Design a protein around this ligand. Sequence first.
Ligand SMILES: Nc1nc2c(ncn2[C@@H]2O[C@H](COP(=O)(O)OP(=O)(O)OP(=O)(O)O)[C@@H](O)[C@H]2O)c(=O)[nH]1
Ligand SMILES: [Mg+2]
Ligand SMILES: [Zn+2]
Lengths: 14, 216, 456, 30, 223, 852
Amino acid sequence: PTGEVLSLVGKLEG
Amino acid sequence: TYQRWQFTLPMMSTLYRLANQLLTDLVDDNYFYLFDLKAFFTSKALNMAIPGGPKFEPLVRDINLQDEDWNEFNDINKIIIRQPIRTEYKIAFPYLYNNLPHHVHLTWYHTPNVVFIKTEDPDLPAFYFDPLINPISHREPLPDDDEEFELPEFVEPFLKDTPLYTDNTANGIALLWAPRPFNLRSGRTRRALDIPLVKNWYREHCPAGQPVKVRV
Amino acid sequence: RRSRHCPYLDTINRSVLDFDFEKLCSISLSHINAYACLVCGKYFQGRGLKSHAYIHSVQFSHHVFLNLHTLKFYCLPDNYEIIDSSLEDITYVLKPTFTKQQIANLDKQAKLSRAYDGTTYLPGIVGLNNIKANDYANAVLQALSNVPPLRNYFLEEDNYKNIKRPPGDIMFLLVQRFGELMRKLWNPRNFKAHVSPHEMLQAVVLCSKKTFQITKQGDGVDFLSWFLNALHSALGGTKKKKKTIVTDVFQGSMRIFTKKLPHPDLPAEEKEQLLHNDEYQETMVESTFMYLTLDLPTAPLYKDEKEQLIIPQVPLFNILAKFNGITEKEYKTYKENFLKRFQLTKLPPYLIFCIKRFTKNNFFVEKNPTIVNFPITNVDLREYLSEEVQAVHKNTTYDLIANIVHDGKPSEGSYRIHVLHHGTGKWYELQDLQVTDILPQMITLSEAYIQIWKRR
Amino acid sequence: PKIQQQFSDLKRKLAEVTEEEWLSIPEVGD
Amino acid sequence: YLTEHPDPNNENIVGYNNKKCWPRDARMRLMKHDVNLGRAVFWDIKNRLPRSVTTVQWENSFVSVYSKDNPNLLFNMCGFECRILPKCRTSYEEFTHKDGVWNLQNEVTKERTAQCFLRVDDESMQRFHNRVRQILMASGSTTFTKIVNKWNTALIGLMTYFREAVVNTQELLDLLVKCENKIQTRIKIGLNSKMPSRFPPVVFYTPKELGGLGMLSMGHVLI
Amino acid sequence: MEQTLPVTVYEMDFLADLMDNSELIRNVTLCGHLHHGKTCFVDCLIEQTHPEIRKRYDQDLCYTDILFTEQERGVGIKSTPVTVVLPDTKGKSYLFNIMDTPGHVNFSDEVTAGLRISDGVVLFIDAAEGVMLNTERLIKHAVQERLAVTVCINKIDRLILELKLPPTDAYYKLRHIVDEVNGLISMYSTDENLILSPLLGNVCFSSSQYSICFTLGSFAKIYADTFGDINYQEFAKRLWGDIYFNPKTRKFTKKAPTSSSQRSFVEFILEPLYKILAQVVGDVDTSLPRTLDELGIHLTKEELKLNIRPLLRLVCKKFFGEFTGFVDMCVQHIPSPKVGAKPKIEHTYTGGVDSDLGEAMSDCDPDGPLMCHTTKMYSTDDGVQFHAFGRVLSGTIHAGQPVKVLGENYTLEDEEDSQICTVGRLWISVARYHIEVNRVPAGNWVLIEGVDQPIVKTATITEPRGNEEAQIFRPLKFNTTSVIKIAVEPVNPSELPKMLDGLRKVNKSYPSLTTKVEESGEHVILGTGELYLDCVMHDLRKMYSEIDIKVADPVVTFCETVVETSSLKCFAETPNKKNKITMIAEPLEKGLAEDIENEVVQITWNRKKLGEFFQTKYDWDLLAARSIWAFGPDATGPNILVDDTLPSEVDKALLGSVKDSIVQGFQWGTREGPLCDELIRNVKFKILDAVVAQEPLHRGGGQIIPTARRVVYSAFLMATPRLMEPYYFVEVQAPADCVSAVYTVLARRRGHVTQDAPIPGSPLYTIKAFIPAIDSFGFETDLRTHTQGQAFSLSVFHHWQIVPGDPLDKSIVIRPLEPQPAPHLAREFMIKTRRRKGLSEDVSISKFFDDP
Ligand SMILES: Nc1nc2c(ncn2[C@@H]2O[C@H](COP(=O)(O)OP(=O)(O)OP(=O)(O)O)[C@@H](O)[C@H]2O)c(=O)[nH]1
Ligand SMILES: [Mg+2]
Ligand SMILES: [Zn+2]
C-alpha cells in the first residue's frame, strides 16, 4: 500500500 | 576461396532428403495468404493486427472513431449489419473497406494450386497413376483402314530407343518443387551467420494447441 | 403550334435560378444535353422518353425546361418548343452577350441598373462571393476588370474562341472561364447584385496544380503575376505569339544597367584594376516587364518629433526615383554584389505598380507599414525616360484607376480594392462582398499594395 | 547567409569615415 | 441564407464547431438541414450588429440545433457544459440518481420531462491545471505550509464552484489526482533529493494546528 | 507515321499493306478461366514477333496486364488488344487482331466488349483443372453471340511434371476435356455444325510456360521435316482418336493389335514429349546431350548451364519453334471477316441486315460509308484524355476527317444524342506501344482520338452529310448483372468537382459500371463483386481523381414482387377528374420471367407468334395472349402488362389512343417501385378497366402517366408484397480434405451446398453452392484464411429469391447495430434501404390511393 493518491473514478458507487 | 558451387542432381536430391526435417514440404505460397510481409506492411500502415500477426505502434495518429460527428454519410441508422467486418477483410481489400489508405500494399491474389503427387515408394515407376488421383470415368471422324496410307521404312517415334523414365526422374521432378536452395544446381557461398534455419519456421502459422508464451 | 400558349409559364420563379455553377445532370453527372427546370432551378439530362428531365417533369409536375446549351425552352412531358418574348431575360442572364455598340458605350453609363430583386448596382461594381480564403483572388480579378481594353477583348467570345490549342491543354479553361466571369460581372440586367467566382477559382486551382487554392490565401502579387503569364501563354496559340492582348495592354520594356561590383574585401589597387577587366563594367540587358516592383524604404525603427503619428510615410516620387538613369539599387547574391540601374524604355498604356510590403527577415515575414503619399489624378513619368524615348512618347501623364490594399497581419490578412467607376468619377471600395463608397482623398491613407494606372 | 556577410556592405561604407571623426565620438554618459 | 452565400458543395460542415467532450451519440449530429439552419441563424444575428461597434465571430461562437434528427440540446455557460435530453426523445430508460444529472421536470404538472447532464468546461479544467503549475513554479524557496495553503484554496474554489460537475467529469478526477501527486512530489523533493518509496500520508494530511500540513484531499488514499 | 517502334521480325509497312486486304485479317478474342495461360501465350507470341522483347527467366513477362494494379495483384483487370503479323505453317503471313481478355469472373464485361468486335473466340482450357465456371459461361456467351469457336488446351506440362500421369491416362484426360467442351457447346447451341475435335483442327495443345504449341498437323509437319516422304496432313488425320499403329504393316487400324499397343496419339505425340521433358528434368547431366543430339538440337555451353526451368523453356523453344498450330487453327476455322460480316450485322446492327446499309456493311469494302463502332475507351496514363477503341465495319477512317458520333440513346426520330466531332490521330494498338497511322480501312481495329467527349460506354461513328438513314449498333448485352452497391463521398467537401470528374472517368473506363446520384444526394456505384469494386476504388482514388474519398459499407440492390393476387381491384383518376384507370396485380408463372429476360419471347414479335407461345407453353387463353401491352421497365422485363378490358366496356380505339401513355406510366412504375424504389420483378399487371376522356388535351401527357404509376403502385401494394434478394452461385476448388471446412464456412452464412464432386484426373474437388449476395461479403477471404489458402472460390450472380421475412410489417422492432434473425430480414432491409434512398420512414398500402 503505497502512499500515492488514486483516482476516484470507479470508486464512487457507495 | 570457396566462393561458388555447382552440384549434380543426385547430390542435390540426397542433400534435400537429409535436410527434410528442417523443411515444411510446401509447394506453394497459397499458405501465406494474408500472412506475408506485404500483408503485414498493410496491417502496420493501417494500425491493425492480424490475429496471428504482430502489433506495432500507429504509423499515423489513429483517427478516433469517437471523433467524427455522425454526418449523413456515416449514420448508423442506415447501415445493414450481417457479419462484422473483420480486420482480415480490410487487409484483403485495402481500397474498398478503408478510408484514407496511405502507404498500403496490394497483396498477390490466388495462384493456381500446385497439384504435386509426392512419391512415397521409390520402387514405383516414375509415371504412375497414384491412388490420390480421382479415376477418369471412361466414356470421331477417323479415316478408314482400307486407305492406302503407308509410313516409310525409316519412320518410327522420335525417341523409341530412349527409355521413358530412369532411376533419377522422380528425384528431379521433386527437386523441381523443392524449396530454395534445393531447387538450384549452382550458385554462390554464404555465411553461417547469414543462413537462418528457423526463419521459415516462425514465418508459418503457429501449430495448434500451443501455450500462450510460445504463441507470443 | 401550342407554342406561345403554354399555360404553365406562370410557374417559373426567377428567385431560384442560379446559373453560376457547373452545368451537369444532377442525377447522372453527364455534361450532354443538360436541361434546367425553370420551376426549381435544377439541371437534368435532356429531353426524350425515359430521360431524367422527362421523369422529373411527370414526377413533380414541373412542366418547363430550358436547354442550357441551345437557349430554347420546352414544355414536358409533351415536349413542344415554347416561344415567348417575356422569357428573354432568363436566357440573357444564362449567357450574356455584348454587342459592339454596347461595349463602346459600356463606360458611359451614369444610371444605376436594377437587379430582379430590389437591388440597385452598377455594371462592373459587383461583389464576388467569398469562399473560405478567396479575397486575394477576388481583389485581383476585380482589378483586372475595369481595364477597358482587356475587358472589351474578353467581353466577346468570338475573339478568343477560334484560336488553336494542343490536345491535352487545360490552360484554356482559364481564358474561357475568365471571359465568362467578365461577361457575368458586366451583365447590366443581373438577377442579383453579386456573382460567384467558384468556377473561375476551380479552374485556377486546377491549372496552378494546387497552388493558389481557395481554402488558403496566397500572395496577391504572386497570383497576379502567375495569372497574367498564364493568360499570355494560353492566348499564344501553339506557340509564343509575341503579341497577345495582355502584352498589348500591360507589358512595357525596361533597360537594366547591371554593374558587377569587384569585391568588398579586396584592396583598393586590385579593386580599381578590376574596373578595366570589363567583367565589372556596366552592361545593358534590356528586357520586358508586366509590372514594376517598387521597394519601400525600411521603416525608421524609431519615432521622431515630426508627424508624431508612429506611422512613417514616403512620397510616390521618392520610390519612383529608382527607374531613372541615376539611382543604383544594391543586389546581393552569394559571393557577388551588383549595382543595378534602371531606365524605362517602353511605357504601356496601363501601368502596374506592385509595391513590396512583405519581406522575409532572418526569422519571419514582416509587413512594411509605410504608407505611400501619392496623388491620384495626375502623375508625369516623363523624366524617368531616356531622352531617346521621350521623343517617341507623346502622352505620359497617368491616373490611378485601381488600388489593391492589404490589411492585418501577414498571416491573418485581408484584401480590399479601391476602384474608380468610369462614366462617373466615384471611387468604390469593394471588399469580398461589400461595396462601400470611399472619398477620393482617403485612398492615399491606405497601405497601397498593388496599383493600376491609365495613360490617358 | 552569415552575419558578417550581411554586415559587409555597412562595414565597407564605414571604411569611408575620417580619423578626425573617429576620435571625436561622444560617450553615452550624456 | 443560401441565396446570400450559395453552397454548391455542401461545404457548410467543415468549420462547424462541436463539443468534443461529449460522446459521439451525445454531440450534435451534422445533418444537412440542421447545419444549414445553424449557419443561417448565426448569419442573421451577425447581420444586425454593425462591424464598426462590435463583431460576432463564428470560430468563437457555437450554435446547437435540436430537431427531429438531433435529440440533445447543448450549451456552455459560466464554465459549465450542459446537455439537455428530453425524456420522450431517445431515453427509453429508467434513471437512478447520479450526481451530475439534474431532473428537469415541468413546473405546472410536476412531471419529469428532461434531464440535464453537467460537465466542467475544458477551459476551466485548463485554468485549474495552469494554476497548479503556477503554484509549483513560484514555490521556489517558499514554505511547504504556504504551498499547501495555495493548493487548498485552489481546490476549495474549484470544488465549491463546480460541485456536481466535478463528480460527473471523469477527466477532472484524473487531473485532480495528478496535480495532488505533483504537489506531494514537490514536497518530497524539497525534503530530500532522492524520491522515497511508500511515503507516509500522515505528514501531509495531519491538520496544520497539530504539526502537519493540513492538506486537503480529493482522491482515493488508503492509509 | 515514322514513329519509333521496337525491332520486329515483320515490318510496319507490310502490316499496313496487309491491313488493306480484308481476306487476311483475323479478329480473335482470347478468353478462358482465371490464370489459364492467356497472357503468357500472348507474351510468347509477342516474343516470337519481336526478337528484342524477352520474358525474364524466373519472372514471367506478360506484355499485357500493363496496369500497376494488374502487376501488383497478379490478375488481369482489363482487356488488351494486340495487332501482329503471324506466319502460317505453310509459310503464309496473316494479320491477327488478338484481344486478350481477363479471366476473372467479375470482369466478364471486358470479355463481352471484346466479343462484340471480335469474329472468333479462342478458349483456353487448363490441362489439369479442366472445364470450370468461367469456361462454361464463356462458351455459352460466345455461342449466343454467334462467334466461331476453337479451343487451346494449355498447361499440358502439368500432366507430366505435377500429376506425372502415364501417357495413356494423360490422353484420357485430354479426351475427357474435349468431350466436356463438345457437350457444353451442344447444350447451348441447337446447331451441330460446331463440333470440336483435334482431327478437324478445332483443338490445339499448348504449354505457354515452356513455349510449346502444336496441332496434329504441326507435329506431323515436324515428322515430315525430319523424314521427307510423309503427307503431314494425312498423318494428322490419322494420329488422334483410337487409331492404333501396326508397325509390321506400317498401317493404322481402328482395331488394337496385341491388346497392348497404345493409340497413335500416345505412340507418336505424347510419348516423345514425355521423354523430352523427363530427360531434360531428371538426367540433364548424364544423357541429355545425347538426346538433344538425336533430336538435332544443339545448344551452347552458356545455355546448358541454366537451371532446370530455363533449360526446359530453351530446349522446347528450340525443338518446336513458332506457334504455327495456333495460326492454322484460327486461319481455318474463323471467318475472313469478309465472310463473317453478315452474321455480325444480323446480330448487332439495329437496322437489320435487310436494310440498305445492312447490305452496304455486309459487303465490307473500304470504299463505302463510314460505320465505325466503338466499344472500349482506353485512358492515357495521365488519365486526362480517352481514346475510343473500336472496329471499322465499312469505309475508311482518315486522321483529321470530321465525323458524326451517335450515342446509345440516338434514334432516327430522336436526333439529339448525336454530335459532330473531329478525329485527331489514329493508332494501331500493340499492347505496350501504339503505331500511329494516317488511315484505317474497314475490317480492322483502331484507336480514335478526339471523339471521346460525346460518348460514355458505346458509340457508332459515321460520316456527316450522308448516311441519313443511320442507326446505332445495339448496346452491349452483359453476361451478368451488377448488384453490389457502394456509396462514395469526398473527405474535404471543397474537392467535390475532382471526385465528380473521377466518377465520370471510371464510368467511361469500366464498361458495366453504373454511377448514379440518389435522392438524398448520395453518390452510388454498382459493381459485380468486391475485387471489381476494389479496383474501381483504387483507380478512382489514384489515377483519375487525386483526392481522399470515403466509402460506405457494401450493400446489394433488392427487388420487389408479389406472392398473391391483389385483395381488391385498385383504381385512380387524373387530377382532371377524368381518365380513370383500374388495375389488378398477380404473380407470374414459374419460368416466364426467365423466358422474357433470356429473349425466348420478344414484344417485337408478331402478335400471332406471341400469342402462339403464350397459349402453347404457359397455358394461357389466346384472348389474354393477344392482349399484351408491355414487358416491364425495358422491352425485356420480368413484369407483364395485359389489358383484360373487354370490348363491350371500353372503345378499343379510344383505349389505343392512350395506350402509349399508359405503357409509359407502367414502365416507370415498374422501374421505380413503391416499397423501396427498386425494380419490380415477376408481376402481371392486368388493366381491368380504363375510362378514357374524349379530348387529347384532356388525356395524355401530364394526366395519365402520374395516374398510371399511382394505380400500378396501389395494385402492387394491395397484393401481398415481398422483397427479393440477389443470390450468388459459388464454385469452390478445394483439396479432397477441406470439403467439410467449406461446408462449415458456407453454413455460417445462410449458404446451401448444391453439389460436391471430384475433378477426374486430379486430386481436387469442386463444391458448388448458393450464397446470398448480401452475406457473400468477405466469404472468399473467410474460406481462404480458415482453410489456410488451400480452398479458392469464385462467385457470380445467379437468380433472385424472396427474402425470408415479410417486409411491410410494422410490429417488428429493429435495433440499429444488431444482426437480425431471418424472420424479419425483409423488414430490416426495407426500412434501412428506405433511409438510404432518403424516402419517408415507412410506406402504407394507402399512400398512393386516391381515397386517402
Ligand atoms: N505449369 C504451367 N504454368 C503456367 C503455364 N502458363 C502460364 N502458367 C502460370 O499460370 C499463371 C497465370 O498467369 P497468366 O497466364 O499470365 O494469367 P492469364 O492467363 O492472363 O489469366 P488472368 O490473370 O486472369 O488474365 C502464371 O502465374 C504462370 O506462371 C504453363 O504453360 N504451365
Ligand atoms: Mg491475362
Ligand atoms: Zn423540380
